[PDB]
């Protein structure tokens, strides 16, 4: 009986109709308090009802993006189409413009990313691996301008709004801020770069799980190109990680608020006062959260315990909030008519020529500092360009490779902020 | 910072018709009612007209009913207000203003501008 | 006609740096849910807002500001008095389609 059992966010389908007939009720009378309680209700009964279609679908769910890329969408239309009181709008854009929730969001998921990884692999990291993931953007982008000046695009756009938002965090957390850093150093509209970027992402991520196993099939034609699952060569490993307690009480997750507000305080005081511009170009305070975070987990002061606890709680935005964030961005940010504009043929061979540059750079940079050509590819150039930490298990799993799960969440999380400070300093510097 | 700036004619015959136009930068035009605000010299403030999003409901005062048009074009972040065959007493300086609901009744105004009617 | 008519008080109040202002603003009939504001306005300049619900504050305001009741009666305080608050301020209503501003008492010295 899929009429009584079926779930629909946790939820039997005869509560969900409870709480659907609050809403229309609401909606019919015209009442409606304009604030956060207002606005987590509409927005939280809408995104559960849309995200369930979105992710029940066959083609859709495994390439599209599945549920938070529907929601966006229907909400842009409904708003398109005028369905929505002006109540209602007023409610969502409160508690996303004034409120400012979404400051809150984007602090609490750089925090928990960052502060997660263990100090001791950070501290290795910055030897052999990240100039890799340095080579790979830089690689790519000569790729990306080469083929753009084939059909006249000039080079503030390629590299502003093709070759930045590939080699990001997916939507979540690599294409809100990159639009809000535009926003605020350059000065103009923000609905178009983020409307003709999410279709940019969306299309590049296909071509990554494509090339996975294309270059499976080359490590198997050839031999000496490749690893038999193995990052590096000619070497022995013998750290033995330390424990956590294994006890994670309310009172580490509670911490975890406190860092994740005071990083954003001192970043907007240092921004603002202390050091506007280091040189000609200034720096957003984004790029200086993720300093001050990075050196924060440097120095060692957190425990063991701390640091497991900010990730718990990055955990519960980033599963059960973000549906009700995709609203608010569908109602406040998209601009319908660029999506469609932007899907040609030019945009496809772009995007499909950027991944195989960055493929090619990661390659040839890895073989300088150690590692086996091939599966320095798929675990810094495939890996780092896609929809963040949702996809690391797609491509993974496309090849037979599932021991690089590590040094996949470490190119996620790491050069999840790396890619904003090179932004901050790219905007500054063109214009 | 939000600004919004509006500019118009002045100096009309006893019949004739005038278009009034502003424009704004600081914040999401789209998504904000608007409305229409008027002072004749030496007296006290009053409405004149109002209008949703997406133009989807009109409300007039009672004194200029049947006279004036109110429209907006959200492309280029513009709003207009058409004025048929004038009269005299309309002489006033002319604000613009966004109404936000509960959470502050006017916040951001025009510098306004000045129309007058022969004689 | 069908409008709420909104009355001032105290005309020309006038007053030295240093003391209390206490206007009043008087409604027909009764102002649904509490929906009221106060404004001034220097002369030669657009309008301010002061008190956006029948209590609360804008961002800008200082701490001396404030106002109180509900119904058909209302009152604006000035705890004590600046060089810089001598304008005219006014009583705004928006609770149904028909806003209806009131007329302005003057804040000046002796």
């Known amino acids: 009986s899929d009429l009584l059992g079926f779930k629909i966010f946790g939820m039997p389908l005869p509560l969900y109709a409870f709480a659907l007939i609050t809403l229309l009720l609401s909606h019919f009378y015209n009442a409606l308090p304009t604030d956060i309680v207002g606005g987590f209700a509409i927005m939280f009964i809408i995104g559960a009802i849309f995200g369930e279609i979105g992710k029940r679908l066959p083609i859709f769910n495994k390439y599209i993006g599945g549920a938070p890329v529907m929601i966006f969408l229907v909400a842009a239309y409904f708003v398109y189409a005028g369905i929505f009181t002006q109540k209602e709008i007023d409610a969502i854009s409160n508690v996303m413009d004034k409120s400012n929730f979404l400051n809150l969001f984007i602090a609490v998921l750089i925090t928990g990313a960052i502060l997660s990884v263990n100090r001791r692999l950070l501290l290795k990291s910055l030897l052999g691996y990240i100039p890799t993931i340095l080579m790979g953007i830089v690689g790519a982008s000569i790729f990306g301008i080469a083929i753009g000046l084939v059909f006249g695009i000039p080079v503030d756009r390629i590299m502003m709004l093709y070759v930045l938002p590939i080699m990001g965090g997916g939507n979540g957390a690599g294409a809100v801020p990159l639009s809000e850093i535009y926003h605020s150093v350059t000065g103009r509209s923000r609905e178009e770069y983020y409307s003709t970027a999410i279709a940019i992402l969306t299309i590049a991520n296909i071509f990554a799980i494509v090339f996975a196993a294309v270059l499976d099939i080359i490590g198997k034609k050839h031999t000496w190109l490749s690893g038999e699952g193995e990052l590096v060569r000619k070497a022995s490993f013998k750290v033995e990680e330390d424990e956590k307690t294994g006890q994670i009480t309310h009172r580490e997750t509670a911490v975890g608020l406190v860092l994740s507000t005071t990083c954003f305080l001192l970043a907007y005081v240092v921004a603002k006062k202390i050091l506007p511009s280091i040189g000609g170009v200034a720096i957003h305070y984004f790029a200086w959260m993720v300093l001050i975070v990075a050196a924060l987990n440097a120095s060692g002061l957190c425990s063991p315990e701390i640091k497991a606890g900010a990730k718990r709680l990055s955990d519960f935005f980033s599963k059960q909030l973000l549906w009700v964030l995709m609203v608010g961005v569908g109602v406040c940010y998209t601009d319908l008519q660029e999506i469609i504009n932007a899907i040609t043929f030019a945009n496809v061979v772009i995007a499909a020529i950027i991944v195989i540059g960055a493929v090619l750079g990661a390659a040839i940079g890895g073989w300088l500092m150690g590692f086996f050509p091939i599966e320095s590819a798929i675990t810094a150039g495939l890996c780092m360009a896609n929809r963040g930490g949702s996809g690391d298990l797609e491509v993974l799993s496309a090849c037979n490779r599932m021991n690089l799960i590590s040094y996949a969440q470490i190119s996620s999380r790491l050069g999840g902020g790396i890619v904003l400070v090179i932004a901050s300093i790219v905007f500054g510097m063109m214009i | 910072e939000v600004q919004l700036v509006e500019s118009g004619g002045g100096l009309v015959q006893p019949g004739g018709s005038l278009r009034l136009s502003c424009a704004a930068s600081?914040?999401?035009?789209?998504?904000?009612?608007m409305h229409w605000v008027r002072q004749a010299p030496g007296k006290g403030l009053e409405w004149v007209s109002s209008?949703?999003?997406?133009?989807?409901?009109?409300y007039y005062a009672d004194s200029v009913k049947g006279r004036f048009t109110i429209s907006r074009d959200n492309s280029k972040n513009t709003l207009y207000l058409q004025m048929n065959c004038l009269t005299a007493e309309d002489t006033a300086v002319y604000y613009c203003?966004?109404?936000?609901?509960?959470?502050?009744?006017?916040?951001?105004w025009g510098q306004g501008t000045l129309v007058t009617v022969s004689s | 006609g069908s409008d709420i008519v909104l009355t001032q008080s105290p005309a020309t109040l006038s007053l030295s740096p240093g003391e209390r202002a206490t206007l009043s603003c008087r409604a027909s009939?009764?102002?649904?849910?509490?929906?009221l504001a106060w404004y001034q306005q220097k002369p030669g300049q657009a309008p301010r807002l002061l008190i956006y619900?029948?209590?609360s504050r804008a961002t800008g305001v200082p701490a001396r500001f404030s106002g109180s009741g509900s119904g058909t009666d209302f009152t604006l305080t000035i705890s004590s008095l600046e060089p810089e608050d001598f304008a005219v301020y006014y009583c705004?209503?928006?609770?149904?389609?028909?806003?209806?501003f009131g007329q302005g008492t003057k804040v000046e010295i002796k």
């Open positions: 619900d029948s209590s």
């Open positions: 600081g914040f999401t035009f789209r998504n904000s009612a």
């Open positions: 209008i949703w999003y997406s133009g989807s409901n009109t």
């Open positions: 203003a966004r109404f936000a609901g509960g959470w502050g009744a006017y916040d951001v």
């Open positions: 705004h209503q928006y609770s149904d389609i028909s806003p209806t």
């Open positions: 009939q009764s102002v649904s849910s509490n929906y």
